[PDB]
Every structure is written in structure tokens, then in C-alpha cells.
Prior knowledge:
The PDB classes it as viral protein/hydrolase. The entry lists the keywords SARS-Cov-2, viral protein, VIRAL PROTEIN-HYDROLASE complex. The entry is titled "S-ECD (Omicron BA.5) in complex with PD of ACE2". The structure is cut from a larger assembly and holds chains A and B. By secondary structure, chain A is low in regular secondary structure. In chain A, the strands form two sheets. Chain A has a two-stranded antiparallel ribbon with strand order 1-4. Chain A contains no helices and four strands. By secondary structure, chain B is mainly α. Chain B has 23 helices and six strands. In chain B, the strands form three sheets. A two-stranded antiparallel sheet of chain B has the order 1-2. Chain B has a two-stranded parallel ribbon with strand order 3-6. The longest helix of chain B has about 30 residues. At the A-B interface, loops of A face α1 of B. The complex binds a molecule of 2 linked components (NAG-NAG) (5 copies) and 2-acetamido-2-deoxy-beta-D-glucopyranose (NAG). The site of a molecule of 2 linked components (NAG-NAG) has 6 residues of chain B, from loops.
Amino acid sequence: KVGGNYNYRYRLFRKSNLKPFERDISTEIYQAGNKPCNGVAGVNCYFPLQSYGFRPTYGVGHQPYRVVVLSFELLHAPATVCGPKKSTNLVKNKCVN
Amino acid sequence: STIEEQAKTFLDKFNHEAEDLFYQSSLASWNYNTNITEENVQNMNNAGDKWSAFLKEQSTLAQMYPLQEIQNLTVKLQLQALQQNGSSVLSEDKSKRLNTILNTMSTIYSTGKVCNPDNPQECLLLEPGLNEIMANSLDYNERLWAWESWRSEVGKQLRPLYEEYVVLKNEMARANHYEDYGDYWRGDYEVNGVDGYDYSRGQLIEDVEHTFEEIKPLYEHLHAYVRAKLMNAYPSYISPIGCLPAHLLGDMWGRFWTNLYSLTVPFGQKPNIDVTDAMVDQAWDAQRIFKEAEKFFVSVGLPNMTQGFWENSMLTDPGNVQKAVCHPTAWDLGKGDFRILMCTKVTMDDFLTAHHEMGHIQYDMAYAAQPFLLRNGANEGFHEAVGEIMSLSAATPKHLKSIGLLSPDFQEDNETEINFLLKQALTIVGTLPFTYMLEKWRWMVFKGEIPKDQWMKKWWEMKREIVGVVEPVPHDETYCDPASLFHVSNDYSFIRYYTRTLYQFQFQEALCQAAKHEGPLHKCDISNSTEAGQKLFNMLRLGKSEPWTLALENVVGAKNMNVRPLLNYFEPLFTWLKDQNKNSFVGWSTDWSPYAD
Ligand SMILES: *[C@@H]1O[C@H](CO)[C@@H](O[C@@H]2O[C@H](CO)[C@@H](O)[C@H](O)[C@H]2NC(C)=O)[C@H](O)[C@H]1NC(C)=O
Ligand SMILES: *[C@@H]1O[C@H](CO)[C@@H](O[C@@H]2O[C@H](CO)[C@@H](O)[C@H](O)[C@H]2NC(C)=O)[C@H](O)[C@H]1NC(C)=O
Ligand SMILES: *[C@@H]1O[C@H](CO)[C@@H](O[C@@H]2O[C@H](CO)[C@@H](O)[C@H](O)[C@H]2NC(C)=O)[C@H](O)[C@H]1NC(C)=O
Ligand SMILES: *[C@@H]1O[C@H](CO)[C@@H](O[C@@H]2O[C@H](CO)[C@@H](O)[C@H](O)[C@H]2NC(C)=O)[C@H](O)[C@H]1NC(C)=O
Ligand SMILES: *[C@@H]1O[C@H](CO)[C@@H](O[C@@H]2O[C@H](CO)[C@@H](O)[C@H](O)[C@H]2NC(C)=O)[C@H](O)[C@H]1NC(C)=O
Ligand SMILES: *[C@@H]1O[C@H](CO)[C@@H](O)[C@H](O)[C@H]1NC(C)=O
């Protein structure tokens, strides 16, 4: 967006790393010091979600990218999604396999 | 806990907020520079004021992490470049007075008007004016007038303001734990605690005065040659043993002797190489120039341009009435956005300015991965020392004939190499004594060695001793000749132009030995060589991460600046001058004066 698209954010401060396929949406104020701040930003107390400032006159490697990760698993159910089976023509009156 | 670990998460948020606001400010400034209107001056100082307050508050917040308990080097170097108070350590009224003085000093220089004693209705500005009278005129009294009138009209208003600016600057610098304002300036070449790469503030003076003692044997022969050549343009106005009148050197102050080339050309009718008819007969344009400047860096082993450089830069003057202040510049707006703004004409001077300006974009692309506060040259005189070697290499008569601008059957002889080397010496080695003497006077006057009643006395004593020029008109303690220069009345450091001139030839000799050059040094070319690109990129990519005395060690193999490559570049010219001054008197006497006769 010419002027900045601040709709996209991301997390910058977390106490401990995530787990595989875990998702956090907390908006609690991170604390980098030794004093509590009671959910108020200030010194040594940061808001954990910063924003991307996407503008069109950026450089490749700073421009937005849409990502779609796929994941397959086969737990215990003896049928589900699988791709297409192709079928050719059909002849008659001939010994065929 | 662990105060060192809170600084890391503080510089973790700064490096993003600053990187977001700086881009806004830079883009708002670009939009004004490339297109001047009435609101693009408003929404550019709006962003400037919004970016300055951010930094002024982030420094207050960063004053909480003591530089002692820190142990890393990058976080220490980032906090140490953010904790600086600068001003706002004075009082409020004293800061107001300092700002008023600084804003009143530059408009006496910008709007100076010198009037003709015979026709005082119309007068002359400096630039379209005295700056061309002092350049082309060959009359003695006309130059004397254009010199004295400017030094006496804009030379006596700056004195009672400079007297107070000195005091206020010293008072500010001593509140930041320095000892004067000269030390504050020298505290840019300072490196502390790296165990083998230290450099104190008091060593810059010693190194400068130690390297200047080896340039004197060449500056003396050049001075004698130029004196004997000037004795024929203004006969009976120059003594054959004395100094040179300070208003015949080619410009207002004598900073460059380059305008003395029409009088002191070594070999007669032998025009030096100038590819400007070949360009216009081969139909080049402002696109082919940059496309040929980029292929050079791609051959030397450096990346391409970012394809956002091609569709966002402005390299042509806008034909219509879309007035833009175009002075060749390389912008680094951030977030991977590099642009170049220059009014390109089809001349070889623009052909070399393109290489110069792209040598800045390459440096900027190199260190673009550093933190925000570490994206700069290793020190003051690096970002231009890097740009100048490219233009040194792109102008050789061997890179020109392999680019399609110089006929193959062209044969060069020494009678034109001498011309090229002398034209180079009038610009390179002609300004070193001036730079050194000016920045020595300034340091001594800031430290308190020169009392306020002996300013012009010591100024002209040093002008006669070090650089060897004498004033035509006596000057009492009502004048201020140093403040008649743009960099003195506008509060700029003036020593980067001395160290750059040495770093340049150090880099050139270090690189073009990795290219396996054979002949003289002034013929070196680093094209089609990757051992030079890969040796330069190992310094270009650091930025301010490591000390400048370690960035120097990477390229040249030495830990300090050296004047031996600068003397090895001018060895043919030196050998020619030496056995050409056998009938002259090498040196000057500091007793002659053009007024006491
Ligand atoms: C240079 O600046 C002027 C003043 O801002 C521009 O003039 C207008 O700019 C707006 C900006 O979007 C346009 O929508 C208008 O059409 C412009 N009007 C005119 C008469 O120019 C001008 O466009 C700017 N130059 C360029 C090349 O954009
Ligand atoms: C503090 O200094 C250490 C080195 O003493 C830095 O460690 C390097 O960090 C970078 C990432 O920024 C890694 O790519 C390097 O591999 C690390 N060094 C080594 C030897 O592995 C550390 O980054 C510094 N602190 C900060 C906040 O940058
Ligand atoms: C920058 O200025 C600040 C204050 O403007 C300095 O912090 C104060 O320094 C004084 C003298 O050392 C102390 O008495 C105060 O306790 C400090 N804190 C305050 C006033 O909040 C700071 O030291 C200066 N920075 C540098 C590098 O000198
Ligand atoms: C350029 O080189 C030529 C030879 O390559 C020089 O010509 C000779 O110069 C020496 C120097 O005294 C004379 O003794 C010879 O007599 C010259 N040759 C001839 C054929 O006369 C010339 O001097 C050089 N020019 C410069 C400026 O160095
Ligand atoms: C740098 O290398 C290029 C590529 O080898 C040189 O261009 C060649 O020059 C020769 C001699 O003029 C030609 O026969 C080839 O056709 C050229 N090839 C291409 C792809 O252009 C160039 O001359 C070299 N420049 C220097 C200064 O050595
Ligand atoms: C640089 O750009 C030119 C465009 O002519 C291209 O041919 C070349 O492959 C590019 N080099 C790199 C390293 O991308």
C-alpha cells in the first residue's frame, strides 16, 4: 500500500520458543526487566506484536509473500483423500488385458 | 535480569521502530528533492521532526544501560552511539543562543553581496560572481579586488559571532566529558579496548603531522614549478624566492590549484584523452552510461543493480518545468531501496561521476545486513575513498579502448602521461597543505593556544610557513579569513578530506597488486578481476561493526594510513619536476611580502 499497509503483524518477544504446530494469540505485555508493570507499556515492558509496514517501493526480500504449508498424515481411518484415477477408452470384441 | 540482556531486547525494538521512521523521513525528502513544490517542503520537515523526536527520546531511554556492565562488542558499539547527548546538555537559553548564532552565521555567507566601487547599484553574489572572476580572470587588480572585498564584506560580520560560537562549542564539548571541541571532533577515529587495534584521540594529530613531513619534498617541487610558471603570467608581481600571492591560486581561498592548468600545462599542444565526441557520434545516452558503469562492477565480482534501482531512480533532468535540485547523490532510503539522483549529460565527466556514484550504492548494498546503527563507513573518510578508486580506474586509456570509446591504433606517449599526472597533482597534492593547515589552526584555536587577539597573526604566519602563500593586503584583528570558507561558517569537520586522500591510494595500490598489474601505478585497472572484488568486499560488508583500523588491515595489510602509495603514484611526475627545477630555487622565504616593498 502506498503509505503503508499496517494490517499485517507478527510477534517479536516471547518467553520461551514455540512447539511444532503451536499457535499463540496472547497480547500480554512482555517483561524484560525485574519489575512488574501491570499490563502497562513503558520501560522494560514492551508490546509483543509489531507490524509490517509493506509499501510498494520496497526491495525484494522486504516485500510480502504468501505462504501455504501442506501437511499429510494417516492416523487410523481406512479411507480418505487421494488423487484421481485416469481411465482410457474401451474396445470390444477383442481379447484384451 | 542481567543488564546486558535487557540492552539486547531494547536494541531489538529500536532497530525496528527507527528502521520504520527513517524510511518515511528519507522518502519524504526524496519526493521534495526530485520535485520542488509548496507542500513537499511541508510533508518533508514534518517527517524530519517526527524522526528527530523519536531519536531524542530513545536516547533518554537508553541512558539506563551502563556501558560498564555490557560485555559484547556490537551491543556496546550500538549503545555507545545512542547515548551521545551532543547539545541539550547546555542550558535552555544557552542552547537557544547557540542555535541562533549557528543560523545567523550561515545566512551571512549564503546571502553575501559584494558591490562594485564604481557601480555600486548592482553587486555580485559569490557563486555566479566572484567564483568565476577568481577562476578565469587574468588581471591582477581585478583579482585583488574580488579577493579583498569579499574578505572584508563577509569577513567582519562573522568575527563577533565566531568569537562566541567558539566559547559555546567548547562549553558544550566539556560537558560531554571531552576537553574541547577539537577533541570532540577527533573522537571519530577513536578505538578503545580491542587488544591490538586501539587508537586514541591524541594520536590523530601525531599521525597527520608525521605523514605531512613526507609530502613536503613533492609539494616543494610543485610549488617551485607553479611559481616559475606564474612568473610569466603576472611578470614583476612575484618574487623568484618568495611565496605566492594568495589571490592568484585559481579560486577564492586557494583550496584547489586545478584552475592553474591553462597556465602551467607541461607539454604544449598535446590534448589529453577526452572521449566526448566518440560518445555523441556513437549515440550514447543517460541509460548506456549507467549500464556500462554497472557492467564494470559485475566484471569485478560485485552484484547487479536491484531492478528497483532502475525504475525508481531519476537520472535525467526533467525536460518540462519540474524544477529539481540535482547534485549527484546516491540515496539509501532503507528496506533495500537504493536510488540515484543526478542530471546526466553525455560527457566523459558524467561518465566518471556515474562510476563514482555507483561506488556508493555498492558500499551501501554491501553492509545492508548490519543493525541500523552500524550502517556507515568504517570511519569518516571511507565512503568517499571507496567511491574515488572506481573513477580512478574507469578513466585509464586502457579501459576506454576496450569499451569502444578510444580507437585501437591510439598510441600514448609520456608527453601526455606527464600532462595527466600534473593535472592530477594540482587537485590531489595541491590541497593537502591547505587542509592540514586549516584543521591545525582550528584545533589550536579551540584548545586555547591561540588567544583571541592573535588569530589572524597566527593564521597568516601558518599560511606563510606551511602552505607557502602570502597575503597581498595586511589584515588586523578586525578580520576573520578562515570564516570566509563554507566549512568554517557552517560548522563542519575538515580533516576527512586529508585522510581520504591517503586511504584512496592505499586502497588502489592494495587492490591493483591483487590484479597482478605490471607497469606504473597510475595505469592500474581492476576490470575482469575477481581477486580484487573479493578483497574489497571483505571490507565493504563490515560497516561500523569492527574498528576502522581492522577494516584497513583487511585490504591493504597495514594498520594505519601511509603516504608511500601516494608518493609512488606520482613518481614519474616527481622525477620530471626534480630534473626540471635545476635552475629554479626549490623552497620559499617567509620574509617577502607583496605590500612591504
Ligand atoms: C510534482 O509535484 C506536484 C505538486 O505536488 C505534482 O502536481 C500534482 O501532484 C499530484 C500528486 O498525486 C497529482 O495527482 C496531480 O495530478 C499533480 N498535478 C499537476 C498539475 O502536476 C506533480 O505531479 C509532481 N510531479 C510528478 C512527476 O508527479
Ligand atoms: C554478541 O556477540 C556474539 C559473538 O561474541 C554474537 O554471536 C553471533 O550472533 C550471530 C547472530 O547475530 C550469529 O550469526 C553468529 O554465529 C554468532 N557468533 C558465533 C561465534 O556463533 C551475538 O549475536 C552478539 N549479540 C547480539 C545481540 O547480536
Ligand atoms: C547525557 O546526559 C544525561 C543527563 O542529561 C547524563 O545522565 C546524568 O549524568 C549526571 C552526571 O554524570 C548524573 O549526575 C545523573 O544522575 C545522570 N542521570 C540523570 C540526570 O537522569 C548522561 O550521563 C549523559 N551521557 C553521557 C555519555 O555523558
Ligand atoms: C619520453 O621518452 C622518450 C624516449 O622514450 C624521451 O626521449 C629521450 O629523452 C632523453 C632524456 O634526456 C634524451 O637524452 C634522448 O635524446 C631522448 N630521445 C631522443 C630520440 O631524442 C623523452 O625525453 C621522454 N619524455 C619525458 C617527458 O620523459
Ligand atoms: C574484459 O573481459 C571481456 C570478456 O572477455 C572483454 O571483452 C572481450 O574483448 C575481446 C577483445 O576486445 C573481444 O575479442 C571479445 O569479443 C570481447 N568479449 C565480450 C563478451 O565482449 C573485455 O575486453 C575485457 N576488458 C578488459 C579491460 O580487459
Ligand atoms: C546481471 O544482469 C545481467 C543483465 O544483462 C544478467 O545477464 C546477469 O546474469 C546478471 N548477473 C547476476 C549475477 O544476476
